Structure 1
Amino acid sequence: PLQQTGQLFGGLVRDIRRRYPYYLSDITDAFSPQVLAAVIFIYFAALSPAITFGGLLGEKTRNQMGVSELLISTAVQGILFALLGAQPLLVVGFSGPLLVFEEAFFSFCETNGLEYIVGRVWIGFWLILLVVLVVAFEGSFLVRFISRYTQEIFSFLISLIFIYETFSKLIKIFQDHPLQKTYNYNVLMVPKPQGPLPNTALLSLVLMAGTFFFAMMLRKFKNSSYFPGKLRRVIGDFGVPISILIMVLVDFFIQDTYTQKLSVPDGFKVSNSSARGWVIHPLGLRSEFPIWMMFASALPALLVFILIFLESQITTLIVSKPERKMVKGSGFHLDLLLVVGMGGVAALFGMPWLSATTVRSVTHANALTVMGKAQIQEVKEQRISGLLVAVLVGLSILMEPILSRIPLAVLFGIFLYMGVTSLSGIQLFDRILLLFKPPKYHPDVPYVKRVKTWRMHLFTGIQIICLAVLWVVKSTPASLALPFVLILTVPLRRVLLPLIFRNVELQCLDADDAKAT
């Protein structure tokens, strides 16, 4: 699959031939209750980050791109990717690095007196050209170089960032409405509370903890022995929706306490009508775009391409692992082409460019996964789940009355649950846990038995140092260099690590799949 065919666009046609014959099976496998449960869960997990990043992006870019644009982009791109994608299980949405790049580009354009939206259009054109060139030469074959080392480092970092962001949101809620002896009861509540409120912080904390605990308990009940088998599994599949419903109703019955709720724009309207229209003009919105700027937009296009390529391809590698029991097969060349080309086309309309997200995609895959009598029996691989998630995200603007009832604390707890669950499949997390377990309690696995405990611990420590460096770079102002450090981890594995460690130990610890040799 990843190997170069040697012919122009060979990988893309190979992926098409490999995946599209199973198109009828993709629709047929969707008709199941687990599919509906995954649809609801991933719909919430994709809608909430869309709104959060839309708000942040509208704040940073002066509403040039806002919540409505991001929601429409997510809906359209998800629909198209599910319909025509080699790996339908991936969920395309905005991520933190993209927001950082967008704000940096906005600041640069402000400094240089250029139109931000037109610069984005030209970056999108350059991205389309670059992705066409890459897919032509089967540049996705380079994904083979990315080892389990980099995959697990990236997944662990993403999960840690997710958990830390959830806790940071909780800290922000507490700081906005601190527990104080005296409050003011004339506080304006529009657009947001203008002062501290009583019971808001503790109520939000209680709601988040309750939803997290309910989701975890239902997850345990899924594989437990209580109740019949089929009914137990059916209830467990709907665990997250049930927890969300329980906590939403609990908050709803509480009427004298204020808690923040999901907010969606009234209608499908451009965020800043004065600043932009629905369709951007590449030549110029109000003034002539510079020739030098349109020619130099290639470099920002290169940075965005690195971001999207790294994220999407690593997500594809994680989801398509042999342990996941994926059998239909994913296409690296088709997925990258679709994602980057759609991002470039959206840039023309002024919508953001989206990339497959690690946590959303992993949660989508695990939600469809069915586990037989601690082993993954099968994964319900189909296109309808992601298609319906994208359709609902697009319809979220119309579903204002239902959405406004859901507190943000419930979703924060759900996101903590998502991070914790996504930490399961990483071997780096398992070795981090083994750091605490005494040696005798270590499991019987190829790397535990064939590696001296101290050497394996040194391996995990080096990975932890890499994670710490990546986190420091992410926090530092030059957060856009994170993809380059992630790439640099590959030379660390291929060159530096062999000097410290013997070949056999590297083979056991950094195995491609969960198998011996």
Structure 2
Amino acid sequence: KVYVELQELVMDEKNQELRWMEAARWVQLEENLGENGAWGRPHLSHLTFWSLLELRRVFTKGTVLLDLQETSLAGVANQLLDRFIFEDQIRPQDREELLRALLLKHSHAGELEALGGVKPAVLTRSGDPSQPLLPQHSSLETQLFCEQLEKIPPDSEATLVLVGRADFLEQPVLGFVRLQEAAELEAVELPVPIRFLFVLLGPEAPHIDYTQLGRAAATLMSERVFRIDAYMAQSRGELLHSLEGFLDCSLVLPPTDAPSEQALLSLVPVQRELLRRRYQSSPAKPDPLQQTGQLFGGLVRDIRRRYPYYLSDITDAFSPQVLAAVIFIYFAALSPAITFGGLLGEKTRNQMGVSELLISTAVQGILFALLGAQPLLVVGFSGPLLVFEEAFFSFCETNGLEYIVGRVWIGFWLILLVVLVVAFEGSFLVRFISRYTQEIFSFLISLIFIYETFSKLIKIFQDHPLQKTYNYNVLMVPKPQGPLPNTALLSLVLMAGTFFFAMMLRKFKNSSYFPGKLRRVIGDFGVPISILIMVLVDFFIQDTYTQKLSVPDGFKVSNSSARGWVIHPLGLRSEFPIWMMFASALPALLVFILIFLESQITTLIVSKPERKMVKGSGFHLDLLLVVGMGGVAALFGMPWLSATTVRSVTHANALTVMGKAQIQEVKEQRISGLLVAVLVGLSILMEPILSRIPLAVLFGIFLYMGVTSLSGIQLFDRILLLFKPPKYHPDVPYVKRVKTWRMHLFTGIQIICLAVLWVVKSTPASLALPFVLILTVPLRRVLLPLIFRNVELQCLDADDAKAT
């Protein structure tokens, strides 16, 4: 290799004395010196067009001192100016000024902080450095690399490049000096002998940047072919030939308004061929749903895809938006946990109640947030899971078989099933669940959520109907046995007020009022503010009764006489049948199908490419974790939990920030779900806080969640585009390339599917819903093409909302 130094003639700031300060150094890679006094980063040298023009023009008429018999900077300057005057490059009256210039103190980076910095200058006739007259340009390298020595071989010989400005000059001059014997000079502090000297002097001109000129000369000297030619050069003509071959193999990159990495990468063969031609004449030589067919390959690939991002998964949560999302998702996961809890409790002999579901929702959420590949999912108990459990309790009560133990065996088979599917990458089939099925499932589940939210209000209106006459002394423990005045109306008022406040704060988030900081802060905390406002509203009305949240007394079992925190696989009271130890497979198959479909479709909906998710989602790892914790919790009479769609979608929405209408990024982190699970577990401890929160406030929150979950649903948009004259239709691919009646027929087919699913849900055969949903995967691919064209299906059913 080689070491090259570039020094500019500059003035100091304290004594206003012009001097030589080194500006950049080359060991193949160029390092630049900033104004602070440290060295910028090491980078490949890039030259400007004008610098190379200037170097070529001044080298064509340059002054070469080859095999020069000297070892001193002063005498080399003497001989160089002698050959300058002999070649009429400078007038003989200028020899005094240039020799004075070439032999000042050559300062380095070690004394930059000792002095007051360096400023550009021009040596004038009087020897006074005046201020340059031409417009100044701060260094591009001092703005890109300098804003923030052991590699030198022992046998290498250094090169020193001196560039300076002197008004006393007709034209820029170049003197290239090679010594016969490499010698150390006082200009260079590094213990490397100097072989070549570049001196570039002249007057301020158009298009002549002397820093860029010195950079070009130093880059040319750092080039291996030019260096080898210069060591063996016996004339200026050979150096000019080497410079001509250097410019022949240079790549000029013209400006463009579309800077791209791929367009620049298309120039690889040009760069390789130019390098080949430069070294040809030289003596030297140039120096996520993929089936991997590998067992557990998908699981391992999910691990390598998500776990490298683990550090950001904690640091990215340091924002108040994350805290507001935690407050939102805490209630959004706690209230369904409590509600369903007492249902199973009231329907399963308190064998499985709130206590078991709070602990299972807490433990599974903690470990899924800490281990899962998609932390934004919320693990909780779903309606299909309440219905299957009632299906099992009914069968076992019919056949004398026990409950808790069968569910202990169902989970044991569930673990085997999930290990089997992860082993053979069974979660790859989730590549056939196109946007058709995803949107159908999401819209149906949102409609179910809204229907249940309104049905709870209908139920509380039924429990306390509006009457002319009431009984003023009605027992309140455990719940009011008779109707009470002002209860249903106040509950409706609270629910409507919570929904209205949440929607108004959602509008205020995107609104135009208040400082943009406070507004957004206030905007993310919309749901917590609505809950607080309505809770204080109800708390200040002491007389009227409203149903509050109810949490268990402690972390014990709901029925201390039915089971313990664990369950013997072979029986608690009687010998459990051995056929049930094998019969548990088919209902385990059904439960696995339910959990698999729910979790995979939820992950697909949340991790859509249009929602700006750049961290990846692991189908195999998430399915394995969810079903495994379900099976393990079954070993303790604890419930099986799945990634529900509404809670996970709400979690993703609450962690999504909006740009100037446009999704910008999602706060992909593990802290929010972990804290939600911790709070769900601790909800038993904080009973005084939860006992003053009405259920109507949470009903309004549920209505808000169900309404806002329909944002990204294109099926909802196509529902709306059925009641909008075919003119206000937005400019989207499925509108501009599909006939309006064709799009309406497609939407009506999806409506037929939705109606079939909704009818199936309201029937006793509500466990068939996963199977009838996988009868849309057939249609989207098999039939559909029989009545539609390729472009029509590409526009209507798109993977990332693209126009094919």
Larger fraction in helix: 1
| Distance (Å, rounded) in 2 between the aligned partners of 1:301 and 1:92 | 19
How far the C-alpha of 1:406 sits from its partner, in A, is 0.2
Q: Is the 2:548–2:692 contact (alpha carbons within 8 Å) kept by the matching residues of 1?
A: yes
Supply the distance in 1 between the matched residues of 2:609 and 2:558 (Cα, whole angstroms): 44
Please, what is the CA RMSD of the aligned residues?
Answer: 0.5
C-alpha distance after superposition, 1:339-367 (max 9, x if no partner): 00000000001100000010000000010
Report the alpha carbon displacement of residue 28 of structure 1 after superposing the two structures with TM.
0.5
Q: Is the 8 A contact 2:306 2:615 kept in 1?
A: yes
Selected match of 2:370 from 83, 95, 100: 83
User: For the residues of structure 1 that align with 2:701 and 2:358, how far apart are their CA atoms?
Assistant: 20
1:91-125 deviations in Å (ceiling 9; x for gaps)? 00000000000001000000010010000000000
**Distance in structure 1 (CA, Å) of the matches to 2:368 and 2:571:** 30
**Alpha-carbon distance between aligned partners in 1 of 2:365 and 2:760, rounded to the nearest angstrom:** 30
Alpha carbons 2:794, 2:803 under 8 Å: kept: no
Work out the CA distance in 1 between the residues paired with 2:459 and 2:651: 28
Is the deviation greater in 493-502 or in 249-258?
A: 493-502
Q: Which residue among 622, 625, 642 is the counterpart of 1:355?
A: 642
**Alignment of structure 1 residues 436-447 onto 2, 5 Å:** 436-447=723-734
C-alpha displacement of 1:260: 0.2
Deviations 1:372-405 (A, max 9, x none): 1110111010000000000000000101000000
Deviations, residues 10-46 of structure 1 (Å, cap 9, x unaligned): 0000000010011011000011000000000000100
Runs of at least 5 residues in structure 2 that lack an aligned partner in the other structure? 1-287
CA distance in 1, matches of 2:347, 2:748: 37
- Deviation string, structure 1 residues 206-257 (Cα, Å, up to 9, x no partner): 0000000000000000011100111110000000000000000000001110
State the shift of 1:298 in Å: 0.2
The equivalent position to 1:265 in structure 2, one of 546, 552, 557, is 552
List per-residue Cα deviations over 1:70-101 (Å, max 9, x = no partner). Answer: 00000000000000000000000000000000
Shift in Å, 1:414: 0.3
Higher alpha-carbon Rg: 2
Of Structure 1 and Structure 2, the greater strand share is in 2
Post-superposition shift, 1:516?
2.2
Larger displacement relative to structure 2 (197-206 or 485-494): 485-494
Displacement after TM superposition at 1:319 (Å): 0.5
Instruction: Determine the structure 1 residue equivalent to 2:332.
Output: 45
Alpha-carbon distance in structure 2 between the residues aligned to 1:33 and 1:282: 46
Q: In structure 2, what is the equivalent of residue 481 of structure 1?
A: 768
How far apart, CA to CA, are the structure 2 residues paired with 1:455 and 1:481? 30
Report the alpha carbon displacement of residue 62 of structure 1 after superposing the two structures with TM: 1.2
Cα drift, residue 294 of structure 1: 1.0
Tell me how far apart the structure 2 counterparts of residues 231 and 185 of structure 1 sit (CA, whole Å): 48
Higher-RCO chain (CA-CA 8 Å, sequence separation at least 6): 1
3-state DSSP of counterpart to 1:440:
coil
Inter-partner Cα distance in structure 2 for 1:476 and 1:219:
37
Deviation by residue 1:472-493 (Cα, 9 ceiling, x = unmatched): 0000000000010111111121
Taking the aligned partners of 1:515 and 1:222, their CA distance within structure 2 comes to 29
Q: For the residues of structure 1 that align with 2:801 and 2:746, how far apart are their CA atoms?
A: 18
SS at match of 1:442: coil
Which secondary structure state, in structure 2, belongs to the residue aligned with residue 439 of structure 1? coil
Aligned counterpart, 1:213 = 500
Aligned to 2:727, what secondary structure does the other structure show?
helix
Partners of 1:433 and 1:493 in 2: CA distance = 22
Matches of 1:62 and 1:458, distance apart in 2: 49
Question: Given that residues 305 and 616 in structure 2 are in contact (C-alpha distance below 8 angstroms), is that contact kept between their aligned partners in structure 1?
Answer: yes
State the 1:511 CA deviation: 0.3
TM-score scaled to structure 2, two decimals? Answer: 0.64
Shift of 1:335: 0.1
Counterpart selection for 2:422 from 135, 145, 155: 135
The CA deviation string for residues 424-447 of structure 1, in whole angstroms up to 9 with x for no partner, is: 110000000010000000000000
C-alpha contact 2:498 2:534 (8 A) present in aligned 1: yes
Q: Is the partner of 1:179 in helix, strand or coil?
A: coil
> How many Å apart are 1:515 and its aligned residue?
2.1
Work out which of the residue numbers 539, 542, 565 in structure 2 matches 1:255: 542
Distance 1:294 1:486 in 2: 30
2:534 and 2:496 mapped to 1: Cα distance? 10
Matched residue, 2:659: 372
- 1:462 partnered with 2:749: yes
Residue 191 of structure 1 and its aligned partner are, at CA, apart by: 0.7
* Percentage identity across paired residues of the two chains: 100
Gaps of 5+ in 1: none
C-alpha distance in structure 2 between counterparts of 1:226 and 1:159, whole Å: 31
SS in 2 for 1:291: coil
- Partners of 1:252 and 1:499 in 2: CA distance: 61
Aligned to 2:632: 345
Shift of 1:501: 1.2
Q: TM-score, normalised by structure 1?
A: 1.00
The offset of 1:498, in angstroms, is 1.0
1:43-72 per-position Cα deviation (integer Å, ceiling 9, x unaligned)? 010000000010111011111100000000
2:394 aligned residue: 107
Could you tell me whether the CA contact under 8 Å between 2:297 and 2:425 is conserved in 1? yes
* 1:516 matched to 2:770: no
SS at 1:511 equivalent: coil
Equivalent pair of 2:795/2:802 in contact (CA under 8 Å) = no
Q: Tell me, yes or no, if the aligned pair for 2:734 and 2:796 is still in contact at 8 Å.
A: yes
| In 2, Cα distance between equivalents of 1:513 and 1:273 | 52
How much has 1:496 moved relative to structure 2?
Answer: 1.4
SS in 2 for 1:282: coil
In 1, Cα distance between the equivalents of 2:554 and 2:802? 52
Secondary structure of the 1:378 match is strand
Query: In structure 2, the residue corresponding to 1:392 is in which secondary structure?
Result: helix
Matched residue SS, 2:478:
coil
Q: Over residues 242-275 of structure 1, what are the superposed CA-to-partner deviations in whole Å (9 max), with x where a residue is unaligned?
A: 0000000000001110000000001001111111
CA distance in 2, matches of 1:212, 1:483: 32
